[PDB]
Amino acid sequence: NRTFSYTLEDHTKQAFGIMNELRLSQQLCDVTLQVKYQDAPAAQFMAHKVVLASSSPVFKAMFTNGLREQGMEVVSIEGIHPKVMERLIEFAYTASISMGEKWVLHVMNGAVMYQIDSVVRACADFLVQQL
Amino acid sequence: NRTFSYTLEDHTKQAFGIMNELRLSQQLCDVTLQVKYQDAPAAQFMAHKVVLASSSPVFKAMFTNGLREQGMEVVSIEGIHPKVMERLIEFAYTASISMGEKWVLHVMNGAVMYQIDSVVRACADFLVQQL
């Protein structure tokens, strides 16, 4: 004759870890990102639409279009370097971006592009620190 | 000429919140769970295979079968009460189970069934506390 709450704090961190494994194993993926940019060679990025939607309101609006795709959607991406997209996907799955000093401005360009608010601030705060 | 890490701690909590909204709005869903149990009326549960996979190694093994389903898979579920499955899905998306005292044993039955390790322990520790 009572109500009982249990909350595992570490759950989301653990679940995103298994979600990262599935992406790396190319399991349960429904989006492929074909990233072409200037003279850099073309790259493919398999992911889960929901994980991308949860980290990017730009990706959220992109995949929520009513008439659901039967399986795998291919997406063309231009203006973002493939290394930048790789780090933004990694952020979406791991909660962390590690980046070379020379990449920060290009990372923020794609962060603004995909409205990844938190990494826009992280890059902007870093650039001001370099004076 | 340096490497720079940024880590947003709250990211996974925030992303699971948007992931919960999408489930409740029935957006980007790829699994429906038709839960039938004894004399209880039948229920449908729309979810994302990856979120279910990340919280349950039983669901992970269920959906990782090579030949990917073109869109929406319907799953028949028996032996688990629909209120129990509702709370296990909610745990998978929110990291929390709130349950009536009279439900704990039935919750653990489904928690064992879907190998949700953390909620098995939470129920088992609760039942021992009631002597």
Author numbering:
A (entry chain A), B (entry chain A): 49 to 179
Task: Give the published text.
Keap1 (Kelch-like ECH-associated protein 1) is a multi-domain protein which plays a key role in the regulation of Nrf2, a transcription factor that mediates the expression of a large array of cytoprotective enzymes in response to electrophilic and oxidative assault. Keap1 is known to dimerize through its BTB domain, and models of the mechanism of action require dimerization for constructive engagement with the Nrf2 substrate. In the case of Keap1, the BTB domain is unique in providing an additional role in the sensing of oxidative stress.
In addition, we also report here the structure of a mutant form of the Keap1 BTB domain where the reactive cysteine at position 151 has been mutated to tryptophan. This mutation has been shown to constitutively activate the Nrf2 pathway through antagonism of Keap1, and we discuss this structure in the context of both apo and CDDO-bound forms of the protein. In order to gain further insight into mechanism of action of modifications to Cys 151, we also solved the structure of the Keap1 BTB domain C151W mutant. In addition, we have recently demonstrated that introduction of the C151W mutation disrupts the interaction of Cul3 with full-length Keap1 using a TR-FRET assay (manuscript in preparation). An overlay with the apo C151 structure reveals a change in rotamer for the side-chain of Arg 135, but no significant conformational movements with the potential to disrupt the binding with Cul3. In addition, the structure of the C151W mutant presented here shows no evidence for disruption of the BTB homodimerization interface. Superposition of the C151W and CDDO-bound structures shows that the side-chain of Trp 151 adopts a rotamer in which the indole ring is orthogonal to the CDDO ring system, although occupying a similar region of space to the lower portion of the antagonist. Neither the binding of CDDO, nor the C151W mutation appears to lead to large conformational changes, and although we cannot preclude the possibility that additional effects are relevant in solution, or in full-length Keap1, the structures presented here suggest a model where dissociation of Cul3 may be driven by direct steric hindrance with residues in its N-terminal tail.
